[PDB]
Amino acid sequence: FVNQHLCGSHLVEALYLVCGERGFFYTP
Amino acid sequence: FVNQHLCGSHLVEALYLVCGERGFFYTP
Amino acid sequence: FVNQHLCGSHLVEALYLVCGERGFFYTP
Amino acid sequence: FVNQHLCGSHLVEALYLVCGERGFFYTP
Amino acid sequence: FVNQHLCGSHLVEALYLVCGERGFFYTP
Amino acid sequence: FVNQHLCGSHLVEALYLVCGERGFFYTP
Amino acid sequence: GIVEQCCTSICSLYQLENYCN
Amino acid sequence: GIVEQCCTSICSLYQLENYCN
Amino acid sequence: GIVEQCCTSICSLYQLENYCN
Amino acid sequence: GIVEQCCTSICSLYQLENYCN
Amino acid sequence: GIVEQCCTSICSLYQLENYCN
Amino acid sequence: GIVEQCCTSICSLYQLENYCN
Ligand SMILES: Cc1cccc(O)c1
Ligand SMILES: Cc1cccc(O)c1
Ligand SMILES: Cc1cccc(O)c1
Ligand SMILES: Cc1cccc(O)c1
Ligand SMILES: Cc1cccc(O)c1
Ligand SMILES: Cc1cccc(O)c1
Ligand SMILES: Cc1cccc(O)c1
Ligand SMILES: Cc1cccc(O)c1
Ligand SMILES: Cc1cccc(O)c1
Ligand SMILES: [Cl-]
Ligand SMILES: [Cl-]
Ligand SMILES: [Zn+2]
Ligand SMILES: [Zn+2]
């Protein structure tokens, strides 16, 4: 579960950047 | 809008951790 | 050792957030 | 206290790297 | 030079993502 | 490829810190 | 919104929960 | 979902963009 | 220690709180 | 340079591409 | 403390070592 | 390269310094 936790942390930062003004929902 | 960008980056990381399995929504 | 280094990096950020004013010691 | 929060987040990451096996202590 | 340090940390992460396989150069 | 992507993200942050004024090139 | 509420003044991990799904 | 698709194999910023609002 | 306990399996923020001052 | 151009005012992921190899 | 010493003015990786165990 | 050397096994900040300008 740790491997996925680490990945998810990086996913949300990339989403923050790519989505910009649009924002996003993160559903693990 | 730079300090705002920086703050948002840290808020997203914080929500990722506090919300856990629930997930969160980030709307700039 | 890399896998643990990556994990530890995320651990200290979470500790920073959860401990708040209390602070913490990180001993790998 | 927001800029202070942001700075501390980066200091913790920095200590994690510089201190290595020694570990560090973070006291706000 | 602290806010500058903080901004640069986030720029590096951003270039890491946008540039991908191409790689990037960071010159303070 | 994900494992390496995660590692690289941490590599560039460490390079940012260690290289300081010198800066760096990151070539994956 | 979260930026207005948490980027001008610090938010506890508790106020942050208001933004969880 | 995003974890299933992007933690298994790498996703470009274009693939990640599908998860935006 | 923390690495042994939280890098093997996932730790909640409550479990992490044990490592605070 | 990138700091002068992107730390005083925000840069789009596009302007950031100017710094890719 | 580290915040007083390193958040008002930048600290070298060397001054940061003062906070290692 | 850096990924080949430092993602396989751990690199100290001194080893990383080889990749600086
Ligand atoms: C998720 C959460 C919220 C508040 C305090 C904690 O220790 C953990
Ligand atoms: C750990 C450390 C301190 C200072 C310089 C370096 O390259 C590495
Ligand atoms: C790499 C990149 C640049 C700009 C927009 C994107 O979605 C992705
Ligand atoms: C935890 C956190 C991050 C960024 C801003 C805040 O108010 C709080
Ligand atoms: C940007 C990024 C982070 C984590 C996983 C991925 O597939 C891609
Ligand atoms: C928050 C977090 C980071 C790294 C490992 C864990 O078990 C939990
Ligand atoms: C994406 C990003 C990070 C830091 C500063 C900027 O202008 C833009
Ligand atoms: C390396 C670092 C991070 C944050 C503040 C500083 O003064 C220095
Ligand atoms: C600091 C660091 C990050 C990633 C891999 C390494 O070997 C070392
Ligand atoms: Cl990771
Ligand atoms: Cl910041
Ligand atoms: Zn990571
Ligand atoms: Zn930051």
mmCIF file of C-alpha atoms and ligand atoms in Angstrom:
data_model
loop_
_atom_site.group_PDB
_atom_site.id
_atom_site.type_symbol
_atom_site.label_atom_id
_atom_site.label_comp_id
_atom_site.label_asym_id
_atom_site.label_seq_id
_atom_site.Cartn_x
_atom_site.Cartn_y
_atom_site.Cartn_z
ATOM 1 C CA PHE A 1 0.000 0.000 0.000
ATOM 2 C CA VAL A 2 3.015 2.224 0.615
ATOM 3 C CA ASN A 3 4.155 2.117 -3.016
ATOM 4 C CA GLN A 4 0.725 3.416 -4.059
ATOM 5 C CA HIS A 5 0.706 6.043 -1.336
ATOM 6 C CA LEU A 6 4.033 7.365 -2.689
ATOM 7 C CA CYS A 7 2.751 7.354 -6.272
ATOM 8 C CA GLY A 8 -0.479 9.112 -5.337
ATOM 9 C CA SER A 9 1.447 11.889 -3.627
ATOM 10 C CA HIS A 10 3.253 12.575 -6.923
ATOM 11 C CA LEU A 11 0.028 12.241 -8.904
ATOM 12 C CA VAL A 12 -1.728 14.969 -6.977
ATOM 13 C CA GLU A 13 1.202 17.372 -7.388
ATOM 14 C CA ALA A 14 1.211 16.758 -11.165
ATOM 15 C CA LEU A 15 -2.577 17.253 -11.246
ATOM 16 C CA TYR A 16 -2.179 20.507 -9.363
ATOM 17 C CA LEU A 17 0.185 21.695 -12.096
ATOM 18 C CA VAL A 18 -1.524 20.359 -15.179
ATOM 19 C CA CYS A 19 -5.092 21.240 -14.253
ATOM 20 C CA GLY A 20 -4.253 24.787 -13.202
ATOM 21 C CA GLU A 21 -7.378 26.966 -12.918
ATOM 22 C CA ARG A 22 -9.590 23.965 -13.631
ATOM 23 C CA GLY A 23 -8.678 22.237 -10.383
ATOM 24 C CA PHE A 24 -9.473 18.540 -9.773
ATOM 25 C CA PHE A 25 -10.923 15.799 -7.635
ATOM 26 C CA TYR A 26 -8.599 13.094 -6.392
ATOM 27 C CA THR A 27 -10.308 9.831 -5.612
ATOM 28 C CA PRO A 28 -7.894 7.062 -4.514
ATOM 29 C CA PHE B 1 0.000 34.985 -8.456
ATOM 30 C CA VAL B 2 3.235 33.221 -7.525
ATOM 31 C CA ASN B 3 2.824 33.036 -3.727
ATOM 32 C CA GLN B 4 -0.688 31.816 -4.358
ATOM 33 C CA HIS B 5 0.726 29.085 -6.633
ATOM 34 C CA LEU B 6 3.205 28.041 -3.963
ATOM 35 C CA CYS B 7 0.584 27.929 -1.198
ATOM 36 C CA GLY B 8 -1.749 25.831 -3.356
ATOM 37 C CA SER B 9 1.018 23.298 -3.988
ATOM 38 C CA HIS B 10 1.401 22.782 -0.276
ATOM 39 C CA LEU B 11 -2.358 22.694 0.341
ATOM 40 C CA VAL B 12 -2.746 19.891 -2.173
ATOM 41 C CA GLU B 13 -0.064 17.840 -0.450
ATOM 42 C CA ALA B 14 -1.742 18.511 2.874
ATOM 43 C CA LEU B 15 -5.183 17.444 1.644
ATOM 44 C CA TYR B 16 -3.669 14.319 0.107
ATOM 45 C CA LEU B 17 -2.470 13.316 3.602
ATOM 46 C CA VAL B 18 -5.354 14.430 5.810
ATOM 47 C CA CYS B 19 -8.104 13.106 3.558
ATOM 48 C CA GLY B 20 -6.581 9.710 2.918
ATOM 49 C CA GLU B 21 -8.906 7.115 1.390
ATOM 50 C CA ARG B 22 -11.656 9.741 1.194
ATOM 51 C CA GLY B 23 -9.838 11.777 -1.394
ATOM 52 C CA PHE B 24 -10.356 15.514 -1.756
ATOM 53 C CA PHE B 25 -11.251 18.219 -4.223
ATOM 54 C CA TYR B 26 -8.990 21.163 -5.037
ATOM 55 C CA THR B 27 -10.612 24.160 -6.708
ATOM 56 C CA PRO B 28 -8.394 27.216 -7.238
ATOM 57 C CA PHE C 1 18.101 1.492 0.087
ATOM 58 C CA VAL C 2 16.560 3.848 -2.460
ATOM 59 C CA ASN C 3 13.007 2.656 -1.794
ATOM 60 C CA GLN C 4 13.483 3.516 1.890
ATOM 61 C CA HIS C 5 15.080 6.849 1.078
ATOM 62 C CA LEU C 6 11.982 7.750 -0.979
ATOM 63 C CA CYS C 7 9.630 6.624 1.792
ATOM 64 C CA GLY C 8 11.536 8.529 4.462
ATOM 65 C CA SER C 9 11.298 11.727 2.449
ATOM 66 C CA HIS C 10 7.492 11.403 2.510
ATOM 67 C CA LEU C 11 7.509 10.426 6.181
ATOM 68 C CA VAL C 12 9.269 13.583 7.268
ATOM 69 C CA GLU C 13 6.869 15.794 5.297
ATOM 70 C CA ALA C 14 3.879 14.056 6.934
ATOM 71 C CA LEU C 15 5.540 14.438 10.354
ATOM 72 C CA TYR C 16 6.072 18.118 9.670
ATOM 73 C CA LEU C 17 2.331 18.454 9.067
ATOM 74 C CA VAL C 18 0.947 16.212 11.762
ATOM 75 C CA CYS C 19 3.239 17.273 14.589
ATOM 76 C CA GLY C 20 2.785 20.985 13.953
ATOM 77 C CA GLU C 21 3.990 23.094 16.901
ATOM 78 C CA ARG C 22 5.255 19.982 18.668
ATOM 79 C CA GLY C 23 7.959 19.345 16.089
ATOM 80 C CA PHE C 24 9.813 15.998 15.894
ATOM 81 C CA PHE C 25 13.012 14.017 15.722
ATOM 82 C CA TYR C 26 13.607 11.861 12.679
ATOM 83 C CA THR C 27 15.937 8.963 13.274
ATOM 84 C CA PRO C 28 16.384 6.704 10.209
ATOM 85 C CA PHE D 1 2.016 32.216 9.722
ATOM 86 C CA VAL D 2 1.662 30.875 6.183
ATOM 87 C CA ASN D 3 5.074 31.853 4.756
ATOM 88 C CA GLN D 4 6.584 30.439 7.909
ATOM 89 C CA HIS D 5 4.704 27.168 7.281
ATOM 90 C CA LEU D 6 5.981 27.031 3.715
ATOM 91 C CA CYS D 7 9.597 27.726 4.704
ATOM 92 C CA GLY D 8 9.486 25.029 7.391
ATOM 93 C CA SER D 9 8.259 22.471 4.857
ATOM 94 C CA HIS D 10 11.295 23.121 2.723
ATOM 95 C CA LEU D 11 13.673 23.163 5.700
ATOM 96 C CA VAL D 12 12.494 19.719 6.741
ATOM 97 C CA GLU D 13 13.145 18.338 3.272
ATOM 98 C CA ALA D 14 16.561 19.964 3.308
ATOM 99 C CA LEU D 15 17.499 18.515 6.701
ATOM 100 C CA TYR D 16 16.285 15.096 5.579
ATOM 101 C CA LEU D 17 18.867 15.229 2.755
ATOM 102 C CA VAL D 18 21.830 16.915 4.430
ATOM 103 C CA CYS D 19 21.645 14.921 7.652
ATOM 104 C CA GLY D 20 21.244 11.517 6.064
ATOM 105 C CA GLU D 21 21.782 8.542 8.372
ATOM 106 C CA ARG D 22 22.288 10.935 11.289
ATOM 107 C CA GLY D 23 18.716 12.113 11.234
ATOM 108 C CA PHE D 24 17.702 15.552 12.464
ATOM 109 C CA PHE D 25 15.387 17.358 14.827
ATOM 110 C CA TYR D 26 12.841 19.950 13.714
ATOM 111 C CA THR D 27 11.469 22.265 16.391
ATOM 112 C CA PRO D 28 9.152 25.050 15.203
ATOM 113 C CA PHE E 1 16.878 35.167 -0.888
ATOM 114 C CA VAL E 2 14.452 32.803 0.836
ATOM 115 C CA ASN E 3 11.340 33.356 -1.318
ATOM 116 C CA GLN E 4 13.590 32.999 -4.323
ATOM 117 C CA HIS E 5 14.834 29.661 -2.930
ATOM 118 C CA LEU E 6 11.275 28.463 -2.418
ATOM 119 C CA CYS E 7 10.147 29.487 -5.912
ATOM 120 C CA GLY E 8 13.136 27.739 -7.498
ATOM 121 C CA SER E 9 12.288 24.509 -5.676
ATOM 122 C CA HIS E 10 8.857 24.526 -7.231
ATOM 123 C CA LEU E 11 10.159 25.516 -10.671
ATOM 124 C CA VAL E 12 12.494 22.536 -10.689
ATOM 125 C CA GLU E 13 9.644 20.172 -9.880
ATOM 126 C CA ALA E 14 7.579 21.788 -12.608
ATOM 127 C CA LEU E 15 10.320 21.461 -15.230
ATOM 128 C CA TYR E 16 10.864 17.843 -14.213
ATOM 129 C CA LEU E 17 7.214 17.150 -15.137
ATOM 130 C CA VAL E 18 6.721 19.317 -18.218
ATOM 131 C CA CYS E 19 10.009 18.399 -19.872
ATOM 132 C CA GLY E 20 9.764 14.667 -19.345
ATOM 133 C CA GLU E 21 12.191 12.549 -21.368
ATOM 134 C CA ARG E 22 13.754 15.727 -22.765
ATOM 135 C CA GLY E 23 15.153 16.772 -19.433
ATOM 136 C CA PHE E 24 15.785 20.404 -18.555
ATOM 137 C CA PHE E 25 18.419 22.807 -17.333
ATOM 138 C CA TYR E 26 18.070 24.892 -14.176
ATOM 139 C CA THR E 27 20.372 27.891 -13.838
ATOM 140 C CA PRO E 28 19.798 30.140 -10.813
ATOM 141 C CA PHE F 1 8.920 3.244 -15.485
ATOM 142 C CA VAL F 2 6.944 4.683 -12.580
ATOM 143 C CA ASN F 3 9.549 3.692 -9.985
ATOM 144 C CA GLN F 4 12.160 5.644 -11.962
ATOM 145 C CA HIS F 5 9.839 8.596 -12.433
ATOM 146 C CA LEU F 6 9.412 8.773 -8.635
ATOM 147 C CA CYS F 7 13.162 8.508 -8.049
ATOM 148 C CA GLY F 8 13.959 11.170 -10.633
ATOM 149 C CA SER F 9 11.572 13.595 -8.972
ATOM 150 C CA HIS F 10 13.572 13.242 -5.735
ATOM 151 C CA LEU F 11 16.873 13.434 -7.607
ATOM 152 C CA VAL F 12 16.099 16.800 -9.126
ATOM 153 C CA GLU F 13 15.062 18.263 -5.762
ATOM 154 C CA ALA F 14 18.339 17.058 -4.197
ATOM 155 C CA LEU F 15 20.274 18.495 -7.162
ATOM 156 C CA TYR F 16 18.492 21.798 -6.707
ATOM 157 C CA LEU F 17 19.737 21.871 -3.113
ATOM 158 C CA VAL F 18 23.238 20.536 -3.519
ATOM 159 C CA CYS F 19 24.194 22.449 -6.649
ATOM 160 C CA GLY F 20 22.927 25.781 -5.352
ATOM 161 C CA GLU F 21 24.247 28.710 -7.419
ATOM 162 C CA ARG F 22 25.902 26.308 -9.848
ATOM 163 C CA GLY F 23 22.595 24.959 -11.117
ATOM 164 C CA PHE F 24 22.390 21.744 -13.190
ATOM 165 C CA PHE F 25 21.191 19.860 -16.223
ATOM 166 C CA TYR F 26 18.924 16.887 -15.690
ATOM 167 C CA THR F 27 19.027 14.350 -18.469
ATOM 168 C CA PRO F 28 16.841 11.270 -17.813
ATOM 169 C CA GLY G 1 -12.729 28.515 -1.311
ATOM 170 C CA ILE G 2 -9.640 26.848 0.105
ATOM 171 C CA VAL G 3 -7.109 29.397 -1.259
ATOM 172 C CA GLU G 4 -9.020 32.361 0.150
ATOM 173 C CA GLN G 5 -9.456 30.578 3.472
ATOM 174 C CA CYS G 6 -6.028 28.958 3.811
ATOM 175 C CA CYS G 7 -3.428 31.021 1.901
ATOM 176 C CA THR G 8 -4.003 34.300 3.757
ATOM 177 C CA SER G 9 -4.041 32.685 7.177
ATOM 178 C CA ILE G 10 -2.968 29.199 8.265
ATOM 179 C CA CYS G 11 -5.496 26.344 8.439
ATOM 180 C CA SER G 12 -5.468 23.516 10.932
ATOM 181 C CA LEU G 13 -5.463 19.970 9.557
ATOM 182 C CA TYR G 14 -9.047 20.112 10.844
ATOM 183 C CA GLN G 15 -10.227 23.039 8.712
ATOM 184 C CA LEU G 16 -8.518 21.230 5.862
ATOM 185 C CA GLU G 17 -10.902 18.320 6.336
ATOM 186 C CA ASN G 18 -13.706 20.519 5.027
ATOM 187 C CA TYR G 19 -12.175 19.897 1.614
ATOM 188 C CA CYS G 20 -12.138 16.121 1.727
ATOM 189 C CA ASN G 21 -14.640 14.141 -0.371
ATOM 190 C CA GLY H 1 -9.105 5.080 -11.946
ATOM 191 C CA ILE H 2 -6.015 7.284 -11.780
ATOM 192 C CA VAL H 3 -4.029 5.101 -9.368
ATOM 193 C CA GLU H 4 -4.806 1.959 -11.338
ATOM 194 C CA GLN H 5 -3.787 3.620 -14.613
ATOM 195 C CA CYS H 6 -0.885 5.832 -13.621
ATOM 196 C CA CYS H 7 0.834 4.015 -10.777
ATOM 197 C CA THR H 8 1.180 0.826 -12.790
ATOM 198 C CA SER H 9 2.750 2.458 -15.842
ATOM 199 C CA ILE H 10 3.777 6.038 -16.521
ATOM 200 C CA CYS H 11 1.281 8.722 -17.573
ATOM 201 C CA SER H 12 2.194 11.818 -19.602
ATOM 202 C CA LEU H 13 0.846 15.192 -18.513
ATOM 203 C CA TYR H 14 -1.673 14.757 -21.372
ATOM 204 C CA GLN H 15 -3.019 11.523 -19.886
ATOM 205 C CA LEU H 16 -3.173 13.125 -16.455
ATOM 206 C CA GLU H 17 -5.133 15.975 -17.934
ATOM 207 C CA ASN H 18 -8.091 13.553 -18.284
ATOM 208 C CA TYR H 19 -8.477 13.717 -14.513
ATOM 209 C CA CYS H 20 -8.900 17.494 -14.414
ATOM 210 C CA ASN H 21 -12.129 19.403 -13.871
ATOM 211 C CA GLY I 1 11.304 2.526 14.375
ATOM 212 C CA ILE I 2 9.358 4.727 11.966
ATOM 213 C CA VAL I 3 10.957 3.418 8.763
ATOM 214 C CA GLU I 4 10.510 -0.188 9.836
ATOM 215 C CA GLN I 5 6.855 0.411 10.733
ATOM 216 C CA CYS I 6 5.687 2.868 8.107
ATOM 217 C CA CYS I 7 7.682 2.036 4.997
ATOM 218 C CA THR I 8 6.661 -1.609 5.105
ATOM 219 C CA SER I 9 2.930 -0.961 5.413
ATOM 220 C CA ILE I 10 0.935 2.257 5.418
ATOM 221 C CA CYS I 11 0.589 4.449 8.519
ATOM 222 C CA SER I 12 -2.349 6.792 9.168
ATOM 223 C CA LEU I 13 -1.654 10.314 10.391
ATOM 224 C CA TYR I 14 -2.688 8.984 13.837
ATOM 225 C CA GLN I 15 0.045 6.336 13.794
ATOM 226 C CA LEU I 16 2.563 8.907 12.605
ATOM 227 C CA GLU I 17 1.555 11.136 15.464
ATOM 228 C CA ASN I 18 3.339 8.673 17.806
ATOM 229 C CA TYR I 19 6.626 9.975 16.427
ATOM 230 C CA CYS I 20 5.939 13.593 17.369
ATOM 231 C CA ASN I 21 7.479 15.522 20.244
ATOM 232 C CA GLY J 1 16.778 33.468 -16.764
ATOM 233 C CA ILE J 2 14.003 31.314 -15.356
ATOM 234 C CA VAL J 3 13.994 32.863 -11.840
ATOM 235 C CA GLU J 4 13.752 36.410 -13.176
ATOM 236 C CA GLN J 5 11.041 35.368 -15.619
ATOM 237 C CA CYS J 6 9.038 32.996 -13.416
ATOM 238 C CA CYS J 7 9.464 33.975 -9.740
ATOM 239 C CA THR J 8 8.183 37.549 -10.073
ATOM 240 C CA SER J 9 5.194 36.581 -12.179
ATOM 241 C CA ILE J 10 3.661 33.163 -12.854
ATOM 242 C CA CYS J 11 4.700 31.127 -15.911
ATOM 243 C CA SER J 12 2.466 28.836 -17.904
ATOM 244 C CA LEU J 13 3.602 25.234 -18.348
ATOM 245 C CA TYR J 14 4.239 26.506 -21.883
ATOM 246 C CA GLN J 15 6.724 29.248 -20.986
ATOM 247 C CA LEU J 16 8.341 26.618 -18.799
ATOM 248 C CA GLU J 17 9.047 24.542 -21.891
ATOM 249 C CA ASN J 18 11.598 27.146 -22.949
ATOM 250 C CA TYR J 19 13.813 25.599 -20.287
ATOM 251 C CA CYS J 20 13.632 22.013 -21.462
ATOM 252 C CA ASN J 21 16.653 20.431 -23.181
ATOM 253 C CA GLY K 1 15.874 28.025 16.455
ATOM 254 C CA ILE K 2 15.970 26.922 12.836
ATOM 255 C CA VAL K 3 12.936 28.975 11.677
ATOM 256 C CA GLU K 4 14.279 32.196 13.177
ATOM 257 C CA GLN K 5 17.718 31.505 11.730
ATOM 258 C CA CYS K 6 16.740 30.125 8.320
ATOM 259 C CA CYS K 7 13.343 31.549 7.275
ATOM 260 C CA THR K 8 14.322 35.228 7.455
ATOM 261 C CA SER K 9 17.605 34.735 5.643
ATOM 262 C CA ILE K 10 18.887 31.766 3.635
ATOM 263 C CA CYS K 11 21.008 29.059 5.290
ATOM 264 C CA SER K 12 23.801 27.129 3.651
ATOM 265 C CA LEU K 13 23.571 23.333 3.702
ATOM 266 C CA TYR K 14 26.361 23.801 6.254
ATOM 267 C CA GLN K 15 24.408 25.916 8.747
ATOM 268 C CA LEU K 16 21.665 23.352 8.278
ATOM 269 C CA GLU K 17 23.980 20.687 9.660
ATOM 270 C CA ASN K 18 23.696 22.333 13.069
ATOM 271 C CA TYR K 19 20.265 20.724 13.210
ATOM 272 C CA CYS K 20 21.317 17.164 12.507
ATOM 273 C CA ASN K 21 21.309 14.596 15.333
ATOM 274 C CA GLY L 1 23.878 8.480 -15.993
ATOM 275 C CA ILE L 2 22.256 9.806 -12.824
ATOM 276 C CA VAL L 3 19.144 7.608 -12.952
ATOM 277 C CA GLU L 4 21.189 4.495 -13.648
ATOM 278 C CA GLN L 5 23.572 5.278 -10.779
ATOM 279 C CA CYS L 6 21.323 6.796 -8.146
ATOM 280 C CA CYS L 7 17.971 5.087 -8.583
ATOM 281 C CA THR L 8 19.503 1.632 -8.340
ATOM 282 C CA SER L 9 21.421 2.281 -5.124
ATOM 283 C CA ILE L 10 21.569 5.312 -2.861
ATOM 284 C CA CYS L 11 23.754 8.340 -3.633
ATOM 285 C CA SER L 12 25.128 10.720 -0.989
ATOM 286 C CA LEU L 13 24.896 14.459 -1.584
ATOM 287 C CA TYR L 14 28.615 14.228 -2.493
ATOM 288 C CA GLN L 15 27.925 11.740 -5.289
ATOM 289 C CA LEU L 16 25.037 13.866 -6.512
ATOM 290 C CA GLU L 17 27.334 16.845 -6.590
ATOM 291 C CA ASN L 18 29.047 15.246 -9.631
ATOM 292 C CA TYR L 19 25.952 16.119 -11.645
ATOM 293 C CA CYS L 20 26.137 19.840 -10.889
ATOM 294 C CA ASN L 21 27.278 22.581 -13.245
HETATM 295 C C1 LIG M 1 -6.125 13.136 9.561
HETATM 296 C C2 LIG M 1 -5.721 13.896 10.815
HETATM 297 C C3 LIG M 1 -6.345 15.092 11.163
HETATM 298 C C4 LIG M 1 -5.984 15.779 12.316
HETATM 299 C C5 LIG M 1 -4.984 15.272 13.142
HETATM 300 C C6 LIG M 1 -4.354 14.082 12.806
HETATM 301 O O1 LIG M 1 -3.364 13.570 13.619
HETATM 302 C C7 LIG M 1 -4.719 13.402 11.655
HETATM 303 C C1 LIG M 2 25.666 16.817 3.159
HETATM 304 C C2 LIG M 2 26.315 17.930 2.351
HETATM 305 C C3 LIG M 2 26.601 19.164 2.931
HETATM 306 C C4 LIG M 2 27.206 20.177 2.196
HETATM 307 C C5 LIG M 2 27.535 19.963 0.859
HETATM 308 C C6 LIG M 2 27.255 18.738 0.271
HETATM 309 O O1 LIG M 2 27.578 18.516 -1.052
HETATM 310 C C7 LIG M 2 26.651 17.733 1.009
HETATM 311 C C1 LIG M 3 3.808 18.899 -20.990
HETATM 312 C C2 LIG M 3 2.530 19.724 -21.000
HETATM 313 C C3 LIG M 3 2.553 21.080 -21.315
HETATM 314 C C4 LIG M 3 1.383 21.830 -21.337
HETATM 315 C C5 LIG M 3 0.164 21.224 -21.041
HETATM 316 C C6 LIG M 3 0.128 19.873 -20.726
HETATM 317 O O1 LIG M 3 -1.074 19.263 -20.433
HETATM 318 C C7 LIG M 3 1.298 19.131 -20.705
HETATM 319 C C1 LIG M 4 -1.284 22.779 5.786
HETATM 320 C C2 LIG M 4 -1.380 24.066 5.015
HETATM 321 C C3 LIG M 4 -0.731 24.267 3.797
HETATM 322 C C4 LIG M 4 -0.799 25.488 3.133
HETATM 323 C C5 LIG M 4 -1.539 26.530 3.699
HETATM 324 C C6 LIG M 4 -2.199 26.319 4.913
HETATM 325 O O1 LIG M 4 -2.990 27.299 5.483
HETATM 326 C C7 LIG M 4 -2.114 25.106 5.558
HETATM 327 C C1 LIG M 5 3.526 12.683 -13.054
HETATM 328 C C2 LIG M 5 3.271 11.261 -12.590
HETATM 329 C C3 LIG M 5 3.294 10.961 -11.235
HETATM 330 C C4 LIG M 5 2.998 9.688 -10.775
HETATM 331 C C5 LIG M 5 2.671 8.699 -11.680
HETATM 332 C C6 LIG M 5 2.640 8.990 -13.040
HETATM 333 O O1 LIG M 5 2.263 8.014 -13.928
HETATM 334 C C7 LIG M 5 2.943 10.254 -13.499
HETATM 335 C C1 LIG M 6 2.227 9.638 5.123
HETATM 336 C C2 LIG M 6 3.106 8.422 4.897
HETATM 337 C C3 LIG M 6 4.300 8.550 4.202
HETATM 338 C C4 LIG M 6 5.157 7.474 4.039
HETATM 339 C C5 LIG M 6 4.819 6.250 4.580
HETATM 340 C C6 LIG M 6 3.627 6.112 5.284
HETATM 341 O O1 LIG M 6 3.325 4.904 5.863
HETATM 342 C C7 LIG M 6 2.770 7.180 5.439
HETATM 343 C C1 LIG M 7 4.888 26.210 -12.268
HETATM 344 C C2 LIG M 7 5.629 27.333 -11.598
HETATM 345 C C3 LIG M 7 6.376 27.158 -10.434
HETATM 346 C C4 LIG M 7 7.009 28.230 -9.811
HETATM 347 C C5 LIG M 7 6.895 29.505 -10.369
HETATM 348 C C6 LIG M 7 6.158 29.674 -11.544
HETATM 349 O O1 LIG M 7 6.065 30.904 -12.167
HETATM 350 C C7 LIG M 7 5.533 28.602 -12.142
HETATM 351 C C1 LIG M 8 17.658 24.925 2.261
HETATM 352 C C2 LIG M 8 16.730 25.913 2.912
HETATM 353 C C3 LIG M 8 15.346 25.743 2.942
HETATM 354 C C4 LIG M 8 14.511 26.702 3.509
HETATM 355 C C5 LIG M 8 15.075 27.854 4.062
HETATM 356 C C6 LIG M 8 16.464 28.013 4.043
HETATM 357 O O1 LIG M 8 17.072 29.106 4.628
HETATM 358 C C7 LIG M 8 17.273 27.057 3.471
HETATM 359 C C1 LIG M 9 18.783 12.271 -2.643
HETATM 360 C C2 LIG M 9 18.479 11.059 -3.504
HETATM 361 C C3 LIG M 9 17.282 10.988 -4.202
HETATM 362 C C4 LIG M 9 17.005 9.928 -5.050
HETATM 363 C C5 LIG M 9 17.937 8.923 -5.206
HETATM 364 C C6 LIG M 9 19.143 8.986 -4.515
HETATM 365 O O1 LIG M 9 20.085 8.009 -4.717
HETATM 366 C C7 LIG M 9 19.416 10.036 -3.664
HETATM 367 CL CL CL M 10 8.445 8.327 -4.042
HETATM 368 CL CL CL M 11 6.858 27.395 -0.961
HETATM 369 ZN ZN ZN M 12 8.249 10.682 -3.662
HETATM 370 ZN ZN ZN M 13 7.042 25.179 -1.319
#
